[PDB]
């Protein structure tokens, strides 16, 4: 995986060049905002359970065929794996938000997943909906103005949504 730094480093390395002052300044700007970047990891992490369970509960409400007998999320063995997948996606998203790069989310979680759900008989299009709900909840939990210094996080909150959107696009 890469992070915000090593990504640029590798990009520069395969050109055999040092980082320009512009790239460094960019990374510095990124550094100057990194408190808010860990507040979000903290906040999303601290609500992982309810995020997953609320998103899942809503998903099943809107799509009762998933939990109906014969449904892919019926039986407590598959429901657990379903909640598990949700939690995993969320986790890797938080990894992406933490690292400041999507590589960890792509390399490990998302790549090959559409095909996996295809093989299993899992509706990825439902997973994506789950991910969407998780996203909406996560961003709101993130944007909470209580118990934190006020400021702008419009940039970070867009990146996070970028990651969630990547996750969603990967299984649709």
């Amino acid at each position: 995986m890469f992070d915000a730094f090593t990504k640029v480093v590798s990009q520069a390395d395969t050109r055999g060049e040092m980082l320009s002052t512009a790239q460094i300044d960019a990374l510095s700007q990124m550094v100057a905002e990194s408190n808010k970047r860990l507040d979000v990891v903290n906040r999303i992490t601290s609500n992982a359970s309810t995020i997953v369970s609320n998103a899942a509960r809503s998903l099943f409400a809107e799509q009762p065929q998933l939990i109906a007998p014969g449904g892919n999320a019926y039986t407590s063995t598959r429901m657990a794996a379903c909640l598990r997948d949700m939690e995993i996606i969320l986790r890797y998203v938080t990894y992406a938000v933490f690292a400041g790069d999507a590589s960890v989310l792509e390399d490990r979680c998302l790549n090959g997943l559409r095909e996996t759900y295809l093989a299993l008989g899992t509706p990825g299009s439902s997973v994506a909906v789950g991910v969407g709900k998780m996203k909406e909840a996560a961003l709101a939990i993130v944007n909470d103005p209580a118990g934190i210094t006020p400021g702008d996080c419009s940039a970070l909150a867009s990146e996070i949504a970028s990651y969630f959107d990547r996750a969603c696009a990967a299984v649709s």
């Binding site: 090593t6 480093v9 990374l27 860990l38 933490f98």
Partner: protein, 162 residues
């Protein structure tokens, strides 16, 4: 790849864990360090030519035979004198990369992994590069946590050659 963030994640991941305050502390450390490290790499980048020429010259000084022995492992002609400067350049570039990553990761992936193999295979004496690194460490004119960190990668590269 050894860097604070990528590591922290990779640690948490093999445990199947969300990131807790530990990794956040790692991150705080990284970002606090980055303010000096990035400036350091930025500075070093501007001094590349000087440091490389100086280093190569210091090597040629320490080991004159490298400028007056036949063979492709030596720098007695133009090609070799260019190969050497190239290599030293690579080393410095890797230092600047390490300062930016906040760890030895880039130098590990791009340079140290397989260094012994190269050096043994092409008859390049580590001592040649130890002198080049020793020069750079004593001429980069950095100060503060910039120097301390930047010199931790030079000494790390030195250790890798010893």
């Amino acid at each position: 790849m050894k860097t604070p963030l990528t590591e922290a994640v990779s640690v948490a991941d093999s445990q199947g864990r969300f990131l807790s305050s530990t990794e956040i502390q790692v991150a705080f450390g990284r970002f606090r360090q980055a303010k000096a490290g990035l400036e350091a790499a930025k500075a070093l980048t501007s001094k590349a030519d000087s440091l490389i020429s100086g280093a190569a010259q210091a090597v040629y000084n320490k080991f004159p035979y490298t400028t007056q022995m036949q063979g492709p492992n030596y720098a007695a002609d133009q090609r070799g004198k260019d190969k050497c400067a190239r290599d030293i350049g690579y080393y410095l570039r890797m230092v600047t990369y390490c300062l930016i990553a906040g760890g030895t990761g880039p130098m590990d992936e791009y340079l140290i992994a397989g260094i012994d193999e190269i050096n043994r295979t092409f008859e390049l004496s580590p001592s040649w590069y130890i002198e080049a690194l020793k020069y750079i460490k004593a001429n980069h004119g950095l100060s503060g946590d910039a120097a301390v960190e930047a010199n931790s990668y030079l000494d790390y590269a030195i250790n890798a050659l010893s």
